[PDB]
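Ticket #1240: bound-state structure for nickel (II) ion.
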Amino acid sequence: ASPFRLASAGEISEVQGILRTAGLLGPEKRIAYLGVLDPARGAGSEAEDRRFRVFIHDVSGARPQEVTVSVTNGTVISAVELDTAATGELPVLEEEFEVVEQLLATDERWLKALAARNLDVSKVRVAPLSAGVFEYAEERGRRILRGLAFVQDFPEDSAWAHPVDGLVAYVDVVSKEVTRVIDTGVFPVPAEHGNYTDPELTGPLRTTQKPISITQPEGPSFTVTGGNHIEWEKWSLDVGFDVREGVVLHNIAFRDGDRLRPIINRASIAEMVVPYGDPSPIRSWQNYFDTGEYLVGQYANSLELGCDCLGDITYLSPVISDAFGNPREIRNGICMHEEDWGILAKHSDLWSGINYTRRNRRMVISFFTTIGNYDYGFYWYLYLDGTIEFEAKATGVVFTSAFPEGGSDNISQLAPGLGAPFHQHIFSARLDMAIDGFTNRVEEEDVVRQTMGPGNERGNAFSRKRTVLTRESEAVREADARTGRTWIISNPESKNRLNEPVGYKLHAHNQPTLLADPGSSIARRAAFATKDLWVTRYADDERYPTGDFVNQHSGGAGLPSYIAQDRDIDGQDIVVWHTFGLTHFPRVEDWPIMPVDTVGFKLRPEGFFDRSPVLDVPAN
Amino acid sequence: ASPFRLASAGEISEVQGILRTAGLLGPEKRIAYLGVLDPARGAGSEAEDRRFRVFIHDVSGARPQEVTVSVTNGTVISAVELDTAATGELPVLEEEFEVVEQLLATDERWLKALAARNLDVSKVRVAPLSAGVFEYAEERGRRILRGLAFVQDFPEDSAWAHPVDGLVAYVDVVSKEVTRVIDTGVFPVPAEHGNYTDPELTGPLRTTQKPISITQPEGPSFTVTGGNHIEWEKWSLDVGFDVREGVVLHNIAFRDGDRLRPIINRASIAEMVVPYGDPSPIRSWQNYFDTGEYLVGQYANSLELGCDCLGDITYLSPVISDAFGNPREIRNGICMHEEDWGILAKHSDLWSGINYTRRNRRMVISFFTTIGNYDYGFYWYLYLDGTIEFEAKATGVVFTSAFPEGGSDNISQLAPGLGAPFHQHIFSARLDMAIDGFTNRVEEEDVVRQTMGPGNERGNAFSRKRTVLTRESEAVREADARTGRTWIISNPESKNRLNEPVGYKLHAHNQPTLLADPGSSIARRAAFATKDLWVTRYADDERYPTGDFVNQHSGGAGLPSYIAQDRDIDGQDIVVWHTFGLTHFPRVEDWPIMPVDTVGFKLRPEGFFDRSPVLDVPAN
Ligand code: NI
Ligand code: NI
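RESOLUTION: The complex was predicted; output attached.
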């Protein structure tokens, strides 16, 4: 079918065979990542080559390998051994989750720390946390996982309510050694439970909510063909899914009359990092790259009808590979539906006597993932007027600690003795731009204030200025909410009827960027997060802002390296990388389970059309 | 019943009778403004005293009067004659709108200007606009309206497509004299029509949109008692309606257990200003205060079921006074409904095996108004988690001009020869705070970055700092998006279970504030718009950020005068005034009719509750 169709179970199986029948797949080999590759840059590509990229880990301790197979041709295109100390470790394997707790349970240092706290080892849950890169020389080259303990009073108890502060362990997951156990001192383990389904906590449930029924008696207005191709209200796109990025949007275009006009070639959340701002050595190394290290697509939930997605929902069940190369389906992992969006346009004109009102609607493509204590909803919206928007919804259970006696400048109190370390959830949307084709350019537009005087005697004038970003070395931009700064992506060789380059304007939320000291390890490893907007020249090997192997990578791996190429981006095939995130100082209201907090960005047509593209929407 | 109930037709008729009886409402008198006053500050009130404030205009040129009557007691509490040259003219009367075009139709200077452009006077519409305060000394003390011409080719033609640039006229609407006709030169009058209902422009209407039905089989979850008292999912409030302010929310409180806890005593949009940034003399005086000068409430549309408000809607039809004191009902002028709001909270816990998902909902209270070419929707939202939000939706037809041949730094092109001068739509939300009562304070909270070194060896630490605003002189604040600046309103005498003062945090959108030069007439008249947040000590006569009389009134009233009192606001009855707006550089997509653009703000609980207030929300 389409070269952008979702990976089939058969294709995953065929990859497994190909790797097996080559000595790449076997006994101590585990697939840490597998995903289909996007078609190469071309126009008359009438020869389909479905290729898959795989990261293969070796349990014995042997060197991992990056292999690209061709499923169409049943071949191995490349297979390279990786020097992980140089290029970074492979993505954390799901099967290594339990390992940190298991190994620590027989460690005398650990057991001693628990005994001192009178904690039963069988009730101590341990979180498999990414290690990052700090001052531990012995960790370079080794696949380390750090562990923080949470007491679980019983099977259905929420362990997050009972953090064990003053203690942290480091574990080499291949040699299976507890490399270290640090105990800075005993902290009271918070006693209150955070069991949000416990009637004693919830109280009598409300009986006041009457139903809100959302139906489509004639079915939805969008069509799904070729498994993942969507056609909706002039919009056209292909919904892809990657185990690392999650939902990826391909070929977003708009049928402007006779033309199917491209806007965005590929849209994805290429990275997601959660840096913590607690200077306690128990947590100061804590930075979770949910997308890069853990792979958010891998953990997508199976969304239930009527609970997660309301109304007329069309589901996609993406297929992924397990650690052995067998295909695993994520049933109902992606929701697709259209929802009413209030008033689109309205005017009651006195002079003409015409009263006009039209309703708005948006196509929604979403999924929800669970990464330990956090749960994130990723939502992509396409609007009738041409607006494209992304929204991330952060919920789950807050990552806890003990609340220090005498307070804290970096931790807030949730319950008696229970603290919540300050942190941020920072995202990177990778937008492979295609405004009316690939010849694009980006301009930074600032509102311009004018001084009262000659030519502006009443001092009421205000303007705007646009600065073209010509080389990558000038394409690392910061927000300026004060001057209403935005960035416009245009095609200098495609003019609208008023002879102006067609374009789309990116409206950012202007939330704070990475707060960590610039010389910090996280500042270097997640350099993308220190600036709001980056523009690079497209390159098939530049996929993530943090690089291909984020786990225990030293620093400067992605964007800072690409940007260093200083390529021409003025009227070229370019990619926009927008950093946006939430800064959290958890409140009592976030405990025991946090209500959704949101962040995102949007792009609106800016002289893309010759007039409003919604004049043909009826009153119905 | 409740002293916060909406004005009834009988009450308005009684005010008329009381005024007539007092000799204050003879045949030459007109009611420019009539509204019910809120109950006085207190507790033990001795029965009801429904009072109404009225601004009385005199068509014969006599001085207007401000009068307060007690409709309950049949008395005039006060009546004072106004010196308009000093304190400001009364709001524009609806009847004076038609006067501008009518008077100009027989003016020879006007006729000559039209003849020079070959325009038929019977086809030239004149947009009657507020005058402002400029260098025209003869205007001081007179009621002036300025006029800009638009050609209307036929009865149902949209005149905005055909602006007549280079011409403007000033008219005294009382003495009925054209004071000035300015013609700076002819400009081609744009020829394309902007008729969005013309099949020739719309093209064939889409047949692709299938229905989205939203119903509530068991009715809505909120209850309406006493005409305007709403109770929904723990929230309690009274929906009032004022002709100047539009929808006003009273006594917003949350039922936390046995306690009905107040949050906001009164919330309204106390002012709106639309300044233009085109330095052409034809439009450089252009600034309307839709709320203050025109009274947005009197122009509220009657909303259509299914079109304007989709779902199970409960309408309020507010009653206002006509120019003579007779009651007039705005049928279905306010929509009240609850809408589904996606996911509220979600977590799939590995350790406990418990998968939890809850849906969100919001109570919506809204109205839409039309003032000339603009249509604005005002939306207030109450969420399950305790969040309060306001959203303004700006639509209608763009205010046009000619597009200068050699381009423009202050006007954009929409169609051939058609321009759209740059402008802003700035709002002022007046929040009379009552966080767990009237003893409140405001703190400005900035995220704090920390330097790597002693105490922060890994350079990951980040904090927050809060500065209490103690006196009015230090309560005029600006946004700082870069440092995640927010403002927290707390009650220093009411502490949550963790012994922290309860509070609510205001999250602003950090959009650009007033762009006009600080020395401009508009910067002084709309002084409130130059700053993001102001905090004043409550006073019953400090109602609007611009004063009681905005029309043709210079600086001297409003917030700048209030603030000078430098009152104590640290743990006192205080009022928060938040400026938030849209900066518009119209684009081709905004022509022929503008798709909705939005702006707003929200307040989220900040340690107000002892834990999440939505744990009792059913699975459903
Ligand atoms: Ni968080
Ligand atoms: Ni506008």
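RESOLUTION NOTES: Chain A touches chain B through 156 residues (CB under 8 Å).
TICKET STATUS: resolved
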